[PDB]
A and B are shown apart, each in its own frame.
Chain A
């Protein structure tokens, strides 16, 4: 039975809460299972606001080293990324939402907070790290999630991240590859400083029996939306912007060759591909359609 996870054992939670394998090992939690609903609503919350970062709250539970996220919702706050802990404005709508939600079915407890990062990867800024450190300080099992809606679109797949911060004192172990994503230079500094102070979590996605069976029945009529998709005028103001970012990254490495952070043409080359790889992939689905619907004759 797939619905092993949509079950919620409440007494098991409060035994782990008391036991605490997180006060013993600093990097205990390493995995993160994201539900069907949780993914959709978080992606929907990020894009709905769009250009502006907005954060909400996640609900979930713990199991082994996996911090499972079951359900999510929004926090009507402002100044995400510009304020350290911007959720303080609506302390009312955190507890008041879970008090209402527990009457109707959502028994799940506070598991974390998520925010959107439109057009610049998934990572924790210096403002985000100060939020999460103090979140872990008091309100324990709390995981900071990030999603990039504008690139999720252009890249053509779920652009998402799940992170946890380390203590101010103890410093991380060695094993860390960490994959590269284009960071706009305006932000590269902020990232660059506080980037090594935290560690990510291995993301995995699950679903129920009904969800799985519904999505299969849903696909009978959803193939139509795939071949009238067109990721061009949808996210037009990411690709047109990335150019502005790309231009600056070259401008630096050009003068770097001259008189005068290690070969910033190798980054810019990867960015020029990254951004254009998308632009080309876009025109694949376009010609695919011109082939299909236009070329039948009468």
Chain B
């Protein structure tokens, strides 16, 4: 919504203000914002640029990089474990809650189009919620559900003349 316009500001202050090394909370947000907009390559090379000084002092920054590991590995239950771990309020805790939501609907829009049938327990962990909330969340949508075998069954989810006249006048010369 507005995290896009705010991430722009962080990236600028990397090259803008410092002789080289940016602020420790600015590093904490740039890493987590790349994870928010699933840019793991940017998140990978950002981590390798940090000097070992800020790395060791700022140990909460390690808690954010531990999340990025699971997005690379695609251990989706591991993502939700690492999001519910480090409280870095003011700076990062707002963007950590938004991170968990983008990862959820990624894994839902994924699982929906990747599976005709799927185990409820896997489906639960893949999106993050427990067995009941997962079983309920889908029944609202109208997804087919199966007892006994525990198998969720996902349902798969002038202006114009101006353009034309140009392609005429162009080819026309």
Contacts and interface: CB of A to CB of B under 8 A. Distances in A.
B172 A273 contact: yes
A284 B161 contact: yes
B53 interface: no
Interface string A268-291: 000001001100110110011001
Contacts, number: 20
Interface residues of B, number: 8
Interface string B150-173: 000000000011001101100110
Nearest to A287: B160
Contacts of A291: 160
Nearest to A272: B171
Interface in A121-148: none
A291 B161 CA distance: 10
Nearest to B160: A287
| Chain B residues touching A, majority SS | helix
Contacts of B165: 284
Contacts of B167: 280
Nearest to A274: B171
A280 B160 CA distance: 12
Contacts of A288: 161
Contacts of B164: 280, 283-284, 287
Interface in B112-168: 160-161, 164-165, 167-168
A281 B168 CA distance: 8
Contacts of B160: 287, 291
Nearest to B167: A280
A276 B172 CA distance: 10
A277 B161 contact: no
A281 B171 CA distance: 12
A273 B161 CA distance: 18
Contacts of A273: 171-172
A240 B119 CA distance: 52
A271 to B, nearest CB: 11
A180 to B, nearest CB: 14
A191 B169 CA distance: 30
A56 to B, nearest CB: 35
Nearest to A269: B171
Contacts of B171: 273, 276-277, 280
Interface of B: 160-161, 164-165, 167-168, 171-172
20 contacts: A273-B171, A273-B172, A276-B171, A277-B168, A277-B171, A277-B172, A280-B164, A280-B167, A280-B168, A280-B171, A281-B168, A283-B164, A284-B161, A284-B164, A284-B165, A287-B160, A287-B161, A287-B164, A288-B161, A291-B160
Given A273-B172, A284-B161, A287-B164, 17 more contacts: A273-B171, A276-B171, A277-B168, A277-B171, A277-B172, A280-B164, A280-B167, A280-B168, A280-B171, A281-B168, A283-B164, A284-B164, A284-B165, A287-B160, A287-B161, A288-B161, A291-B160
